[PDB]
Amino acid sequence: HMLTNLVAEPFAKLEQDFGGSIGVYAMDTGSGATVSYRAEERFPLCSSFKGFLAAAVLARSQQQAGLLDTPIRYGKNALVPWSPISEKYLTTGMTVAELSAAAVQYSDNAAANLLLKELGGPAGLTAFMRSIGDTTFRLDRWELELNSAIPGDARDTSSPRAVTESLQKLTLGSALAAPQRQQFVDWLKGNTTGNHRIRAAVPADWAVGDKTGTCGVYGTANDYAVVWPTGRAPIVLAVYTRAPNKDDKHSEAVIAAAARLALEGLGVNGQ
Numbered sequence: 001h002m003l004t005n006l007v008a009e010p011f012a013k014l015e016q017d018f019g020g021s022i023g024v025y026a027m028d029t030g031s032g033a034t035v036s037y038r039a040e041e042r043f044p045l046c047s048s049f050k051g052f053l054a055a056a057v058l059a060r061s062q063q064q065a066g067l068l069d070t071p072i073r074y075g076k077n078a079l080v081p082w083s084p085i086s087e088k089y090l091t092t093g094m095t096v097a098e099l100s101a102a103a104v105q106y107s108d109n110a111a112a113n114l115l116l117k118e119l120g121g122p123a124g125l126t127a128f129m130r131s132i133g134d135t136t137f138r139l140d141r142w143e144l145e146l147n148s149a150i151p152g153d154a155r156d157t158s159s160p161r162a163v164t165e166s167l168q169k170l171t172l173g174s175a176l177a178a179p180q181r182q183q184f185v186d187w188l189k190g191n192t193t194g195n196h197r198i199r200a201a202v203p204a205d206w207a208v209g210d211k212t213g214t215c216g217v218y219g220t221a222n223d224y225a226v227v228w229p230t231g232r233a234p235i236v237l238a239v240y241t242r243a244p245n246k247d248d249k250h251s252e253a254v255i256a257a258a259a260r261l262a263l264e265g266l267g268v269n270g271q
């Protein structure tokens with residue numbers, strides 16, 4: 001507690017102007033100081049689970065030395081909406097590593113469902129998260145059904161705090177072996193979908209990797225990231241949003257603004 005919210009930030013005004021709820025957890029991994037706002041509330045994961053999915057595949061590859069190189073063929077029936085990479089390889093197949101990169105860096109839905117199948121489905125990914133000490137995360141459904149973002153529904157949700165804690169374990173801690181850890185970091189660094197979210201608050205001369213989520217309803221969207229400010233320890237953070245009405249729109253600008261407030265609350269001079 002002593003190092004949580006040392007400096008208050010106007011998250012309440014931000015979410016009120018947005019018309020919904022914003023949840024933020026940010027950890028300075030050097031000092032342990034944190035910024036926390038609605039951090040233990042549940043928010044829909046949307047596509048943000050795909051980062052943890054790729055980490056779970058990497059963990060399995062530590063015991064299967066050839067998993068990542070395995071070529072996966074799939075039929076047209078596997079190609080659900082928003083599969084920008086896997087649709088270009090329908091007639092050829094893709095490797096497990098390539099599907100993992102596509103799921104992370106393009107939020108590819110067909111790739112995500114194929115990898116979920118490899119792990120034993122939503123319960124298998126949930127089990128991986130339990131194995132690293134995350135008791136909050138739950139995945140319940142497949143793409144696209146997991147995006148329903150129904151108010152009060154705990155299916156396919158986690159909390160900003162648990163997302164940040166798990167992301168820290170996987171990218172900076174010991175939950176993955178060192179080669180797999182760096183591969184997960186590199187996939188996050190290569191994400192293409194997050195330029196208007198946490199990255200928009202991060203100076204260009206700092207390294208950053210992220211994974212976005214966008215449910216398409218209930219103003220529900222999110223991003224989590226690891227950030228390496230130069231000259232100090234990395235920061236891990238999660239920013240999740242939702243709103244009360246099905247037709248409410250999400251806002252990338254609100255996510256970027258919340259990330260700025262988190263960095264400011266941690267005293268990390270940047271944006």
Ligand SMILES: *[B@@]1([O])O[C]([C][N]S(=O)(=O)N2[C][C][C][C]2)C2=[C][C]=[C][C]=C21
Binds near residue numbers: 082213214
């Ligand atoms: B999941 O949240 O990420 C993808 C991409 N989302 S999006 O809002 O960036 N998008 C670009 C235009 C169409 C969708 C996705 C796609 C569908 C369902 C869930 C997710």
